[PDB]
């Protein structure tokens, strides 16, 4: 999202978009689990030191986007929130530990060719692919540097904790994973504001499958050099998506 | 910059 | 699902977008 490519189209048709209804406006990331659940981020609804605590009726969903401001008719779908869950132990006062947020929607959406869930990893996949080295895709319409016309792409590949720990003065935690290419390794590319709640995917080469491996949570700038994007640890937080899912359905 | 979504969302 | 994760118009035609593999290429 910090360069970045247009997304191919029906490139991540789990992708979601959090709009605010007046003024309507981007919002944040998210991505479609299922029929009636999306994913993204508590920060991108509550973090109280900017002000921000949107409820069900302030916001929309919208599925199935390409263009960033276009109204994609016969295309992208909006939907209602029939409720926000935030995770009960996100610490938005230190270090968004626990950064995730899952929100319902009042009816189930149609799939399509740009619409379709991304599975969450099991331990084994996780096991298998959280791996330092092992690249991930991030797709947003955020800032384009410290904004764009489509979607876009970018493929980080994870940093090990150490690294990680050693770029910053925050504590992190292990609900929390880096991406981002060293100032060595001459690539660069990285999340920004606005990319927030999006997905980290990373494509399975054991049964070809996409699954999301982290959530889009917080930088210090956007594509900083010794600076990495932090994402929520999904498969960490699972039996708390499980637990919410299996009873508010 | 956001066109329009429909009013009846 | 047991869908989840099969792009209709990659996974599920078999087409491939133009940077998988540079993810395959780092597992
Ligand atoms: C967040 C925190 C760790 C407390 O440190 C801060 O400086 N606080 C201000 C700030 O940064 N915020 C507040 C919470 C959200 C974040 C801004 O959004 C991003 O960093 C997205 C974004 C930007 C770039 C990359 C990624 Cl992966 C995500
Ligand atoms: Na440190
Ligand atoms: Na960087």
């Not at chain 1, 270090?95 to 319902?104: E, V």
């Not at chain 2, 910059?1 to 969302?9: R, T």
């Not at chain 3, 977008?17 to 540079?22: G, H, N, Y």
Request: glycine letters at 8%; hydrophobic letters at 35%.
């Amino acid at each position: 999202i910090v360069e970045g490519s247009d997304a191919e189209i029906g490139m991540s048709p789990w992708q979601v978009m959090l709009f605010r209804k007046s003024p309507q406006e981007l919002l944040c990331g998210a991505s479609l689990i299922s029929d009636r659940w999306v994913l993204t981020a508590a920060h991108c609804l509550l973090y109280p030191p900017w002000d921000k605590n949107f409820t069900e009726n302030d916001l929309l969903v919208r599925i199935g986007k390409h263009s960033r401001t276009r109204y994609e008719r016969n295309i992208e779908k909006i939907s209602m929130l029939e409720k926000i869950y935030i995770h009960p132990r996100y610490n938005w006062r230190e270090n968004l530990d626990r950064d995730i947020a899952l929100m319902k929607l009042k009816k189930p959406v149609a799939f399509s060719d740009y619409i379709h869930p991304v599975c969450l990893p099991d331990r084994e996949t996780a096991a298998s692919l959280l791996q330092a080295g092992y690249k991930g895709r991030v797709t947003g319409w955020g800032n384009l540097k410290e904004q764009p016309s489509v979607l876009q792409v970018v493929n980080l590949p994870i940093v090990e904790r150490p690294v990680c720990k050693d770029s910053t003065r925050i504590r992190i935690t292990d609900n929390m994973f880096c991406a981002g290419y060293k100032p060595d390794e001459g690539k660069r590319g990285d999340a920004c504001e606005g990319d927030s709640g999006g997905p980290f995917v990373m494509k399975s080469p054991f049964n070809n499958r996409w699954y999301q491996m982290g959530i889009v949570s917080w930088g210090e700038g956007c594509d900083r050099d010794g600076k990495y994007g932090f994402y929520t640890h999904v498969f960490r937080l699972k039996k708390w998506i499980q637990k919410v899912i299996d009873q508010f359905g | 910059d956001f066109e329009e979504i429909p009013e009846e969302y | 699902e047991a869908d989840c994760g099969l792009r209709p118009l990659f996974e599920k035609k078999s087409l491939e977008d133009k940077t998988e593999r540079e993810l395959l290429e780092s597992y």
